[PDB]
Amino acid sequence: MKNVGFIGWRGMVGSVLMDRMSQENDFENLNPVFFTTSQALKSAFDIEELKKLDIIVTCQGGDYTNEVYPKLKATGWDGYWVDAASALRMKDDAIIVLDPVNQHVISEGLKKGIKTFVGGNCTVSLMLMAIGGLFEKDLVEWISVATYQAASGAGAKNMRELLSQMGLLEQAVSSELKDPASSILDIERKVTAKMRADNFPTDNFGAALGGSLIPWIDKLLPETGQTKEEWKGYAETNKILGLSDNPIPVDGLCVRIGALRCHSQAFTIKLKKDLPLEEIEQIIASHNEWVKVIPNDKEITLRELTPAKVTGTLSVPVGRLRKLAMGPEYLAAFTVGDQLLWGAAEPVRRILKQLVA
Structure with a gap:
């Protein structure tokens, strides 16, 4: 062999x-x-x-x-x-x-x-595993992305720093949280003070992640104003699909949030044709065996469409599927996948x- x-x-x-x-x-x-x-x-x-x-x-x-x-x-x-x-x-x-x-x-x-x-x-792969059906039927004109990226994409030390940061934020108000009648404004004032302190471990991210977010991932590319992570949206989606001769625009903002290993993404997908929501849900669901269409219901979205649920699994749920106020050709989509x-x-x-x- x-x-x-x-x-x-x-x-x-x-x-x-x-x-x-x-x-x-x-x-x-x-x-x-x-x-x-x-x-x-x-x-x-x-x-x-x-x-x-x-x-x-x-x-x-x-x-x-x-x-x-x-x-x-x-x-x-x-x-x-x-x-x-x-x-x-x-x-x-x-x-x-x-x-x-x-x-x-x-x-x-x-x-x-x-x-x-x-x-x-990672971000591009998790996107394609979610809404791949739409690309297979050449129904995508463009995609506007807003990501909620996990610490694992940046590295092992980065996951540790996030966890350390989360601990120090609570420990700064540990006794005040156990008191049911304590002041919330006082509690917040103290965690924000610890977040801004000198001894707060920010070495790997260059800023606080726990209790916050960082709207910048990887180096700046002066050509388009994008970060290399955001640039990979356009460049990699088209090289994967083989449509480099006729590129489909994919761009947006890549933001790092306080999650361990699941990247979540909010999309605004502009379709080339006007199809009903029930037909789009089937096209997304039928592409591969890992993608899962989560109904636009509260209880099910809270149980299914979260980093909490998908961490360590091969499942790629996609939910919050509906038509946007700017036309029935504009689709809303939210996905969560393990990085x-x-x-x-x-x-x-x-x-x-x-x-x-």
Whole structure:
């Protein structure tokens, strides 16, 4: 069987990949070779040991990829490079994977001779897993996005900082909260003071996340005024769908909120045609087996459409579906999906499964 190498398997995204692969018994269909960057297992920088492999799966990061990949391709290596990092997504000899949405694009690349397959941006992947049916029927003119992004997208230290921040905000008023008759304005004054204090751990985010939000993710791109995260909305959605010759506009604001691992998104989707709400609900629901249409009811939305419910699951619920006041061609949609799964480890796990078949 196929000889597969794994790099960055001990990190957060890598650990979710290892766990999901173990759960689905994916190691039974391949010969795994584990790599490490440590000088304390084979070396991840040994080009000759990597040349022996048929497939390479890396969750190590962009800095590793930009160093090792060109050296390995310069030796004449004919194998497959599977990456979770952004580094190679926008290359001509690379395809962005998300098989329940773009199986036809992947299959055509496997025929053409493309050897580099990269997992897509979290926010973009979770969006496409939710409203993919609409894109399959070419019913989307444009999408306006407003995201509610989790700390896991920024890293492991970032999740820890959020949790530490949440603790200090409560601990600043712990006794006052246990007193049923205490002043709310006094309580708030104290947590806001702790949030603004010098000793408040803001090292990883550069601002407070717990009890707040940060309307900026990744570096500024002077060209459009977007952040790299917001830019990926237009750039990646179209490369995944293969519609780079006829680009469908996807833009908006990417905001970091106090959630652990689920990214949630508010959409304003402009449709090309006027279809009834019941027909749109079926088109969304029938695309894939993970998307779930949550009815526009209070009790069900509170139980289903939240980070609380979807964390650690493969389920991609989409709700709050209705027509907007600016015309029956404007659709409202809210989705919640796990960042580490469909937004990181799952598309990577799925393309590997296909390559070793």
